[PDB]
């Protein structure tokens, strides 16, 4: 926490990653898909939400004679999923997860400051301040191959997690760019059922 | 540290204190008892702002996560990321030059100073919807964008023998201990060396002939002469290869 | 120009704007290719990925090839001072000590290049499906193949990668109207075929969705459903029937 | 510090690997959130169709 284990702070600030979600919602809602090639449109929402039906093979006559139906619908279904979220602690499996892992790799670094590693202390200062020079050298040598050995295991450890989290931002980008700005056609690539 | 008072309840028994991870975080005075906090003083790398040097030569120093006040020293200006000493803040909101942390980005502007100031993400812009209101374009225009993607690397390919003991018996046979720390390693580098090529034969291999243009361009008024190769030249790449090739060194 | 009226036609803009305009974007299409042979001509930094894997890689090289002056606790880094020096029986730790050393160098060495060459990998693929499925045929993954409708792309190498240029398509010049879901004309509704409905303030009329062009309503690009007060946002209007003028004569 | 002398640059490329990382940290983000040129924002009427 304190032994040189600093945490830099994310560029974008998380009223930053407010506003960009914001926008997407706005343009998503009022404009459709065209924000997305060139400049936002604007559009009626019930018109937008019968190009996005005619998108499924459901002629829109179906939306345009459904419309107080399926605003009921999608309500009570925005309704069930603020309840689920504000019920089940164990929704957030994979964030929470994330956080653990790195947490857990950080506090195992931290500990091994205080193994032997073979050497007749851990705490540095006291064969620093117990031995002179000619065998100081071999007890802090033994230390210095130990954690720094450690050290390398955790930055190796560190390397392949950032890269499964570049493989999930990916996907995660890709999903954003064909499902939020557009609508996607690949099967069960956005929820179960026709998007 | 800063040994500072505490008011942590030490039972008459106990004598020093700890955290979460065996860390020193409170004593008794052994003359006269008392018990007080340990907390070390703070680091954090200096970090060197700076435009290019081809441009100007004044430098921002950041000092990372430090109060402005144990900073030894202007225009002295605290952020969420650490004390910033070189740029004069700023009320305007401009992109992003030079990165800091938690929405600081600095850069080079106008006699001239750097500037630290809050970002920004973009023109605000309403769209001005409506229940009856819908916006069509009229004109359309043509762009051409352009991915830049890896796709191989230097097949490189080490001896292990020569590298670790270049041409001497006792390191040989001292080598001969690891028993199979060598060509456990040359198997891993020929596996990265074949699956480049492998990379190659995906990325551009998708096609099973050899196609050829003819002679007459008459490609509805297009031009590609710029993309498609040229006879004249010595290796037949085309014109915009050529441009590329010359850029990495 | 006829490979060209099928790649629009594929994001809905029916081929007649092409084969309508074919000089107008045969001068946009090489202006664009122009502008960018000029930035590529221009600025050095457009090939940043391609310069940064080689010097990654160089990098990596170079300090495998500098660790080899280190002593790592041995008296020499000079393998055959050492060896010069020393009899065996000491030379044995000495040694011992330099392959220990210089062997875990080269791990950590192959492990970097191997965790590099997975991500080079995963490049690669995407380069792959890049390829098959835009230069081989025409995407709809909005922004998998530059920003904006999609029509085309032209692979270019580049010293280990490749480059695209993905022909985009972008609408510029936009123009407010007034919408209505349908059209009550003998008090059944009368939808699009396709497009929406628009009108300039005293006329109705049916367009595209993508590049403003009115059609007088006749009935056959408009289909029943129903009757006109279940719609919400409905409004009267005509529509008229084709055969008429084809019955009256 | 002296003894850490001897083992070359077994401290720079640690801290060259995980500046790596964060500065792809922030590209992540980039790649994430920022697909939107402007910064839109929604009218104060919502009279989203129901």
Not at chain 1, 105 to 132: E, M
């Amino acid at each position: 926490k304190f032994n040189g284990l600093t945490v830099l702070p994310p560029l974008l600030t998380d009223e930053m990653i407010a506003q960009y979600t914001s926008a997407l919602l706005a343009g998503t809602i009022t404009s459709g898909w065209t924000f997305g090639a060139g400049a936002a449109l604007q559009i009626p929402f019930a018109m937008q939400m019968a190009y996005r039906f005619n998108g499924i093979g459901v002629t829109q006559n179906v939306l345009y004679e459904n419309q107080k139906l399926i605003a009921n619908q999608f309500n009570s279904a925005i309704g069930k999923i603020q309840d689920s979220l504000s019920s089940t602690a164990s929704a957030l499996g994979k964030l929470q997860d994330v956080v653990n892992q790195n947490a857990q790799a950080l506090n195992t670094l931290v500990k091994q400051l205080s193994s032997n590693f073979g050497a007749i202390s851990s705490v540095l200062n006291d064969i620093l301040s117990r031995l002179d020079p000619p065998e100081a050298e071999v007890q802090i040598d033994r230390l210095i191959t130990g954690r720094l050995q450690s050290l390398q295991t955790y930055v190796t450890q560190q390397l392949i997690r950032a890269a499964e989290i570049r493989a999930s931002a990916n996907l995660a980008a890709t999903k954003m760019s064909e499902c939020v700005l557009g609508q996607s056609k690949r099967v069960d690539f956005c929820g179960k059922g026709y998007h | 540290g800063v040994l500072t008072e505490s008011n942590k309840k030490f039972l008459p028994f106990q004598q020093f204190g700890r955290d979460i991870a065996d860390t020193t975080d409170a004593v008794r005075d052994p003359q006269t008892l008392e018990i007080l906090d340990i907390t070390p003083c703070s680091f954090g790398g200096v970090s060197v702002i700076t435009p290019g040097t081809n441009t100007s030569n004044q430098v921002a120093v950041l000092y990372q996560d430090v109060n402005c006040t144990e900073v030894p020293v202007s225009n002295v200006f605290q952020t969420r990321a650490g004390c910033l000493i070189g740029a004069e803040h700023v009320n305007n909101s401009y992109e992003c030059d030079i990165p800091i942390g938690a929405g600081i980005c600095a850069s080079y502007q106008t006699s001239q100073s750097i500037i630290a100031y809050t970002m920004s993400l973009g023109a605000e812009n309403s769209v001005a919807y409506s229940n009856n209101s819908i916006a069509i374009p009229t004109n359309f225009t043509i762009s051409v964008t352009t991915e830049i993607l890896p796709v191989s690397m230097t097949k490189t390919s080490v001896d292990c023998t020569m590298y670790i003991c270049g041409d001497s018996t006792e390191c040989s046979n001292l080598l001969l201990q690891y028993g199979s720390f060598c060509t456990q390693l040359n198997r891993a580098l020929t596996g990265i060396a074949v699956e480049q090529d492998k990379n190659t034969q995906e990325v551009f291999a998708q096609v099973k002939q050899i196609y050829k243009t003819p002679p007459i361009k008459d490609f509805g008024g297009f031009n590609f002469s710029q993309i498609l190769p040229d006879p004249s030249k010595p290796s037949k790449r085309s014109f915009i290869e050529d441009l590329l090739f010359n850029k990495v060194t | 120009a006829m490979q060209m009226a099928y790649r629009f036609n594929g994001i809905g803009v029916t081929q007649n704007v092409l084969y309508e305009n074919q000089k107008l974007i045969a001068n946009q299409f090489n202006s664009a290719i122009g502008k960018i042979q000029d930035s590529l001509s221009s600025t050095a930094s457009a090939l940043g990925k391609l310069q940064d894997v080689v010097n990654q890689n160089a990098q990596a090289l170079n300090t495998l090839v500098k660790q080899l002056s280190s002593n790592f606790g041995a008296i020499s880094s000079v393998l055959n001072d050492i060896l010069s020096r020393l009899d065996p029986p000491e030379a044995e730790v000495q040694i011992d000590r330099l392959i220990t050393g210089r062997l875990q160098s080269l791990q950590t060495y192959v492990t970097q290049q191997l965790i590099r060459a997975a991500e080079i990998r995963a490049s690669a693929n995407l380069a792959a499906t890049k390829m098959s499925e835009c230069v081989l045929g025409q995407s709809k993954r909005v922004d998998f193949c530059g920003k904006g409708y999609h029509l085309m792309s032209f692979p270019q190498s580049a010293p280990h990668g490749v480059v695209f240029l993905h022909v985009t398509y972008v609408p510029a010049q936009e123009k407010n109207f007034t919408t209505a879901p349908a059209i009550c004309h003998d008090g059944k509704a009368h939808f699009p075929r396709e497009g929406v409905f628009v009108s300039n303030g005293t006329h109705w009329f049916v367009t595209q969705r993508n590049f403003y062009e009115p059609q007088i309503i006749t009935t056959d690009n408009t289909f029943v459903s129903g009757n006109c007060d279940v719609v919400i946002g409905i409004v009267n209007n005509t529509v008229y029937d084709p055969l008429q003028p084809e019955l009256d004569s």
